[PDB]
């Protein structure tokens, strides 16, 4: 994480599993669709979206 | 005599009409429960809709009921 | 407030009417909409702020009305005019690609894009 | 093929009239070789 | 005569059955309204006219049935 | 005489049909309750008094059928 | 005599029809239970008491139809 333009701190974050997505406390203040496999898609989607950011 | 028998028979037929109204009320309420459970928050807007829907469905039932009463009492 | 964002751009990061192409068909968000998570399919997207309307061609992504009325749309690429003839040339190639050919699946994606182009 | 890979291929196809900036072109094609490893042992690099 | 008078009161009863359908019908329109407004709160201003319209049309079929009931009861 | 007494008994049999719809109705309200509650885990405190209300109203239609049956049965 | 006794039997036959609604009713409750439980998993412990309550009420409607039948019998 580039803390300041004169500093740099190595930083870590946890990428959230498909298991995580499933049981996430609020998941009822979002409209999941059973027919859609939104966890198996969203897991993948945030795998990359987060990872790209980490790389950036 | 036949006409007096017919009053009672006719009344019975009208009682059948009520089954539909019973189903009707439930359908409005099922939608209420589903809608509320979906939003946690639509309820105040939806609640006057639900009462209206109950009343109109019920009204058709009432028509069945009053025709029965006319046939029972004469 | 609407959020529309790409990795390399930010487009709207509510906004009056948004019409979105999703796993669940097409979804519309107008003011407050109830909170959803929908994967956006390869798409034609419309965003309207008042009566003013902007038309976007979208590579699929994710849509999420947040329960705080933030319509997070994230997608890889959005102007529809920019996408619009060279693509027709490509479409011939893409048909060719399906013929020979994961590469098979890729060529299938090209067919999906070909459909997406036909809408334009 | 993953969901985001599915989207990726679509995005690449989507970069087809020409008007396409360098950032688009870089975002469309990139060169890398994923070096698979085992235990030390290395299944030799192959283009990503 | 007894047969005719019986027929009026009986025939009325038979007609009353048709109304059950209308009761269900009205409810269906309202159910759709509730779910619809629930899915997008701001759909309401377009939809509420449609709902009352749908109610009225569904009711109209019921009206024709109910007319036949009243005709058998009273003439 | 015999025909009228007979008619009251016939009419009682006929009247039971009305109740069936209320039966299906009650089940539907409870089904909706289960489905809503399974979606939220926690809407229930808001939803439950509404659910009881809807139940009562659906039930009330069946009650109307039943009392009409009693009017015919007892005389 | 013959006609009145006849009418009682006929009316009894008619009475079974009311029960059919309850038959559907009980099933609808149990279907809802299975669907709810498979969707949520964890809701079941609160939901199972409610399911029994709904069952009892559905059955009861059929019982009322039945009791009128018993009077006719």
TrEMBL record, chain B:
<keyword id="KW-0813">Transport</keyword>
<dbReference type="GO" id="GO:0031966">
    <property type="term" value="C:mitochondrial membrane"/>
</dbReference>
<dbReference type="InterPro" id="IPR002379">
    <property type="entry name" value="ATPase_proteolipid_c-like_dom"/>
</dbReference>
<keyword id="KW-0496">Mitochondrion</keyword>
<dbReference type="GO" id="GO:0015078">
    <property type="term" value="F:proton transmembrane transporter activity"/>
</dbReference>
<feature type="transmembrane region" description="Helical">
    <location>
        <begin position="11"/>
        <end position="33"/>
    </location>
</feature>
<feature type="domain" description="V-ATPase proteolipid subunit C-like">
    <location>
        <begin position="9"/>
        <end position="71"/>
    </location>
</feature>
<comment type="similarity">
    <text>Belongs to the ATPase C chain family.</text>
</comment>
<keyword id="KW-0138">CF(0)</keyword>
<comment type="function">
    <text>Mitochondrial membrane ATP synthase (F(1)F(0) ATP synthase or Complex V) produces ATP from ADP in the presence of a proton gradient across the membrane which is generated by electron transport complexes of the respiratory chain. F-type ATPases consist of two structural domains, F(1) - containing the extramembraneous catalytic core and F(0) - containing the membrane proton channel, linked together by a central stalk and a peripheral stalk. During catalysis, ATP synthesis in the catalytic domain of F(1) is coupled via a rotary mechanism of the central stalk subunits to proton translocation.</text>
</comment>
<comment type="subunit">
    <text>F-type ATPases have 2 components, CF(1) - the catalytic core - and CF(0) - the membrane proton channel. CF(1) has five subunits: alpha(3), beta(3), gamma(1), delta(1), epsilon(1). CF(0) has three main subunits: a, b and c.</text>
</comment>
<dbReference type="InterPro" id="IPR020537">
    <property type="entry name" value="ATP_synth_F0_csu_DDCD_BS"/>
</dbReference>
<keyword id="KW-0378">Hydrolase</keyword>
<keyword id="KW-0812">Transmembrane</keyword>
<dbReference type="InterPro" id="IPR038662">
    <property type="entry name" value="ATP_synth_F0_csu_sf"/>
</dbReference>
<dbReference type="Pfam" id="PF00137">
    <property type="entry name" value="ATP-synt_C"/>
</dbReference>
<dbReference type="GO" id="GO:0033177">
    <property type="term" value="C:proton-transporting two-sector ATPase complex, proton-transporting domain"/>
</dbReference>
<keyword id="KW-0472">Membrane</keyword>
<dbReference type="GO" id="GO:0015986">
    <property type="term" value="P:proton motive force-driven ATP synthesis"/>
</dbReference>
<feature type="transmembrane region" description="Helical">
    <location>
        <begin position="45"/>
        <end position="73"/>
    </location>
</feature>
<protein>
    <recommendedName>
        <fullName>ATP synthase subunit 9, mitochondrial</fullName>
    </recommendedName>
</protein>
<dbReference type="GO" id="GO:0008289">
    <property type="term" value="F:lipid binding"/>
</dbReference>
TrEMBL record, chains E, F:
<dbReference type="GO" id="GO:0031966">
    <property type="term" value="C:mitochondrial membrane"/>
</dbReference>
<keyword id="KW-0378">Hydrolase</keyword>
<dbReference type="InterPro" id="IPR035921">
    <property type="entry name" value="F/V-ATP_Csub_sf"/>
</dbReference>
<comment type="similarity">
    <text>Belongs to the ATPase C chain family.</text>
</comment>
<keyword id="KW-0446">Lipid-binding</keyword>
<dbReference type="GO" id="GO:0016787">
    <property type="term" value="F:hydrolase activity"/>
</dbReference>
<feature type="transmembrane region" description="Helical">
    <location>
        <begin position="46"/>
        <end position="74"/>
    </location>
</feature>
<keyword id="KW-1133">Transmembrane helix</keyword>
<comment type="subunit">
    <text>F-type ATPases have 2 components, CF(1) - the catalytic core - and CF(0) - the membrane proton channel. CF(1) has five subunits: alpha(3), beta(3), gamma(1), delta(1), epsilon(1). CF(0) has three main subunits: a, b and c.</text>
</comment>
<dbReference type="InterPro" id="IPR020537">
    <property type="entry name" value="ATP_synth_F0_csu_DDCD_BS"/>
</dbReference>
<keyword id="KW-0375">Hydrogen ion transport</keyword>
<keyword id="KW-0472">Membrane</keyword>
<keyword id="KW-0138">CF(0)</keyword>
<dbReference type="InterPro" id="IPR002379">
    <property type="entry name" value="ATPase_proteolipid_c-like_dom"/>
</dbReference>
<dbReference type="GO" id="GO:0008289">
    <property type="term" value="F:lipid binding"/>
</dbReference>
<keyword id="KW-0496">Mitochondrion</keyword>
<dbReference type="GO" id="GO:0015078">
    <property type="term" value="F:proton transmembrane transporter activity"/>
</dbReference>
<feature type="transmembrane region" description="Helical">
    <location>
        <begin position="12"/>
        <end position="34"/>
    </location>
</feature>
<dbReference type="InterPro" id="IPR000454">
    <property type="entry name" value="ATP_synth_F0_csu"/>
</dbReference>
<dbReference type="Pfam" id="PF00137">
    <property type="entry name" value="ATP-synt_C"/>
</dbReference>
<keyword id="KW-0812">Transmembrane</keyword>
<dbReference type="InterPro" id="IPR038662">
    <property type="entry name" value="ATP_synth_F0_csu_sf"/>
</dbReference>
């Amino acid at each position: 994480d580039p803390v300041s333009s004169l500093s740099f701190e190595p930083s870590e974050k946890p990428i959230f599993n498909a298991k995580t997505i499933e049981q996430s406390p609020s998941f009822g203040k979002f409209e999941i669709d059973t027919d859609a496999n939104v966890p198996r898609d969203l897991f993948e989607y945030t795998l990359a979206n987060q990872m790209l950011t980490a790389m950036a | 005599q036949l006409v007096l028998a017919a009053k009672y028979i006719g009344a019975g037929i009208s009682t059948i009409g009520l089954l539909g109204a019973g189903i009707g009320i439930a359908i409005v309420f099922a939608a209420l429960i589903n809608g509320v459970s979906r939003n946690p928050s639509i309820k105040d807007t939806v609640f006057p809709m639900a009462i209206l829907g109950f009343a109109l469905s019920e009204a058709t039932g009432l028509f069945c009921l009053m025709v029965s009463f006319l046939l029972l009492f004469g | 407030k609407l959020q529309f964002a790409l990795p390399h751009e930010t487009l709207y990061s509510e906004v009056t009417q948004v019409n979105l192409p999703a796993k669940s068909g097409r979804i519309g968000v107008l003011a407050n909409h109830v909170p959803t998570v929908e994967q956006l399919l390869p798409g034609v997207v419309e965003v309207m702020e008042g009566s003013n309307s902007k038309k976007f061609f979208i590579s699929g992504g994710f849509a999420t009305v947040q329960p705080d009325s933030q319509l997070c749309v994230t997608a890889i690429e959005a102007p529809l005019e920019s996408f619009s003839e060279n693509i027709k040339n490509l479409l011939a190639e893409a048909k060719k690609n399906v013929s020979s050919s994961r590469e098979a699946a890729e060529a299938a994606i090209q067919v999906e894009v070909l459909e997406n182009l036909q809408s334009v | 093929i993953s969901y985001a890979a599915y989207l990726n291929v679509a995005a690449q196809a989507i970069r087809s009239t020409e008007l396409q900036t360098a950032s688009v072109l870089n975002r469309s094609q990139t060169d890398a070789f994923y070096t698979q490893y085992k235990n030390a042992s290395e299944p030799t690099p192959i283009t990503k």
